[PDB]
Design an enzyme around this catalytic site. Structure first.
Site, mmCIF file in Angstrom:
data_model
loop_
_atom_site.group_PDB
_atom_site.id
_atom_site.type_symbol
_atom_site.label_atom_id
_atom_site.label_comp_id
_atom_site.label_asym_id
_atom_site.label_seq_id
_atom_site.Cartn_x
_atom_site.Cartn_y
_atom_site.Cartn_z
ATOM 1 C CB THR A 22 7.307 -33.405 -45.886
ATOM 2 O OG1 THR A 22 7.775 -34.614 -45.297
ATOM 3 C CG2 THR A 22 6.586 -33.710 -47.178
ATOM 4 C CD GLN A 24 6.265 -27.589 -55.204
ATOM 5 O OE1 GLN A 24 6.684 -26.444 -55.053
ATOM 6 N NE2 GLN A 24 5.072 -27.853 -55.717
ATOM 7 C CG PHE A 25 9.941 -31.460 -55.497
ATOM 8 C CD1 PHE A 25 9.419 -31.603 -56.778
ATOM 9 C CD2 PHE A 25 10.463 -30.232 -55.132
ATOM 10 C CE1 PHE A 25 9.413 -30.538 -57.669
ATOM 11 C CE2 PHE A 25 10.466 -29.174 -56.025
ATOM 12 C CZ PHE A 25 9.938 -29.325 -57.288
ATOM 13 C CB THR A 86 21.083 -28.556 -51.493
ATOM 14 O OG1 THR A 86 20.264 -29.053 -50.425
ATOM 15 C CG2 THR A 86 20.381 -28.683 -52.825
ATOM 16 C CD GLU A 87 25.477 -23.553 -48.379
ATOM 17 O OE1 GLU A 87 25.390 -23.209 -49.574
ATOM 18 O OE2 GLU A 87 25.984 -22.874 -47.490
ATOM 19 C CE1 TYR A 88 20.705 -29.740 -41.878
ATOM 20 C CE2 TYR A 88 22.745 -29.205 -40.757
ATOM 21 C CZ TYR A 88 21.418 -29.561 -40.713
ATOM 22 O OH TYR A 88 20.817 -29.730 -39.502
ATOM 23 C CG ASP A 133 7.776 -19.616 -55.751
ATOM 24 O OD1 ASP A 133 7.150 -18.638 -55.294
ATOM 25 O OD2 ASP A 133 7.580 -20.804 -55.378
ATOM 26 N NE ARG A 137 6.220 -20.117 -51.363
ATOM 27 C CZ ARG A 137 5.732 -18.913 -51.654
ATOM 28 N NH1 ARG A 137 5.337 -18.089 -50.709
ATOM 29 N NH2 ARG A 137 5.657 -18.511 -52.899
ATOM 30 C CG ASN A 138 10.800 -21.005 -52.241
ATOM 31 O OD1 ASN A 138 10.645 -22.136 -51.741
ATOM 32 N ND2 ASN A 138 10.005 -20.510 -53.175
ATOM 33 C CG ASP A 151 14.165 -25.093 -53.511
ATOM 34 O OD1 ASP A 151 15.251 -25.731 -53.593
ATOM 35 O OD2 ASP A 151 13.202 -25.478 -52.856
ATOM 36 C CG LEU A 154 14.784 -25.777 -58.033
ATOM 37 C CD1 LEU A 154 15.090 -26.506 -56.725
ATOM 38 C CD2 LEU A 154 15.392 -26.559 -59.198
HETATM 39 C C1 0GW Z 1 11.757 -29.739 -45.513
HETATM 40 C C2 0GW Z 1 12.965 -28.794 -45.569
HETATM 41 O O1 0GW Z 1 13.422 -28.619 -44.213
HETATM 42 C C3 0GW Z 1 14.711 -28.256 -43.983
HETATM 43 N N1 0GW Z 1 15.563 -28.133 -44.995
HETATM 44 C C4 0GW Z 1 16.853 -27.800 -44.768
HETATM 45 C C5 0GW Z 1 17.713 -27.644 -45.945
HETATM 46 N N2 0GW Z 1 19.001 -27.399 -45.878
HETATM 47 N N3 0GW Z 1 19.423 -27.286 -47.200
HETATM 48 C C6 0GW Z 1 18.347 -27.463 -48.024
HETATM 49 O O2 0GW Z 1 18.354 -27.421 -49.252
HETATM 50 N N4 0GW Z 1 17.265 -27.696 -47.267
HETATM 51 C C7 0GW Z 1 17.365 -27.585 -43.495
HETATM 52 C C8 0GW Z 1 16.491 -27.733 -42.391
HETATM 53 C C9 0GW Z 1 16.938 -27.543 -41.076
HETATM 54 C C10 0GW Z 1 16.049 -27.661 -40.026
HETATM 55 C C11 0GW Z 1 14.699 -27.976 -40.275
HETATM 56 C C12 0GW Z 1 14.226 -28.197 -41.547
HETATM 57 C C13 0GW Z 1 15.136 -28.063 -42.636
#
Ligand code: 0GW
Length: 269
Positions: A22, A24-25, A86-88, A133, A137-138, A151, A154
């Site tokens: 979880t 910001q949004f 978005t890109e994982y 920002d 963390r970003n 981000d 954003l």
């Molecule tokens: C709450 C956001 O948490 C996370 N976001 C992304 C993520 N990939 N691309 C993106 O935009 N966010 C990948 C993660 C992988 C493992 C654990 C937490 C993740």
């Protein structure tokens, strides 16, 4: 297809596979697009975002493509809540990655993380696009350990006033004096923040000014005092991060200059 512009993804093309966390949004999930392509799916909590403004800007963000920028694939707009696709990035946020002591990072790895971010930021600067920002963390980390900036821009669409004004959730510890004193954002406020991010990296994810409140931090930096050298930073690395913190914004480097300085240190060390 028919009812979709180039910025719009059909949510029916998504397969949801795992809850990631979880933010910001609200909730973020891992899934697939059209059965095959890994994506992250951000579910935007009602009332958290200026959605129409964000959607217009998403058109611009789609065209920001650099290998060290987390790619925006599109938005699912026709609905409540909207989704951002978005890109994982399998290894999650840079801050948590830095804090995991099992990784046992070498300083060459830490400098590579700085270089990754710097390349992304030099690209954004070349497009006259401010992050606004930048912080660990970003940034996100992929399955190969590559850091990418996420981000970007954003914060302009966040409706929570505690986040938007120097507010209980404003990024005081990443902000230069002119931002804290008079809300003067520029390329040079991104530069300042990048220096703090280098400090975060070399500190393995310590909070900047960890013994101070935000109010104390603001007083400290306004009086000309600074973070000091993380144990893992060499004299040359410290010189680079410190250069980002000149009181006079126009004496701070550009991201092009920082990148050159980082590459020099990589060659020397
Ligand atoms: C709450 C956001 O948490 C996370 N976001 C992304 C993520 N990939 N691309 C993106 O935009 N966010 C990948 C993660 C992988 C493992 C654990 C937490 C993740």
């Amino acid at each position: 297809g028919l009812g979709y512009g180039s910025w719009e993804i059909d949510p029916k093309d998504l397969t949801f596979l795992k809850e990631l966390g979880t933010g910001q949004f609200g909730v973020v999930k891992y899934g697939k697009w059209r059965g095959q392509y890994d994506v992250a799916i951000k579910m935007i909590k009602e009332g958290s975002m200026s959605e129409d403004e964000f959607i217009e800007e998403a058109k611009v963000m789609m065209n920001l493509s650099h290998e060290k920028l987390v790619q925006l694939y599109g938005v699912c707009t026709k609905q409540r809540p909207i989704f951002i696709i978005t890109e994982y990035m399998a290894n999650g946020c840079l801050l948590n990655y830095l804090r995991e002591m099992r990784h046992r990072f070498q300083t060459q790895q830490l400098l590579e993380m700085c270089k990754d971010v710097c390349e992304a930021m030099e690209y954004l600067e070349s497009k006259q696009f401010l992050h606004r920002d930048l912080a660990a963390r970003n940034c996100l980390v992929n399955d190969q350990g590559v850091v990418k900036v996420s981000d970007f821009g954003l914060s302009r669409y966040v409706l929570d006033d505690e986040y938007t004004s120097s507010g209980s959730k404003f990024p005081v510890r990443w902000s230069p004096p002119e931002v804290l004193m008079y809300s003067k954002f520029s390329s040079k406020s991104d530069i300042w923040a990048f220096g703090v991010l280098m400090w975060e990296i070399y500190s393995l994810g310590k909070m900047p000014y960890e013994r101070f409140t935000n109010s104390e931090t603001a007083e400290h930096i306004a009086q000309g005092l600074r973070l000091y050298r993380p144990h893992l930073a060499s004299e040359k690395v410290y010189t680079i991060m410190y250069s980002c913190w000149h009181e006079k914004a126009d004496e701070r480097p550009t991201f092009k200059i920082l990148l050159s300085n980082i590459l020099d240190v990589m060659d020397e060390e």
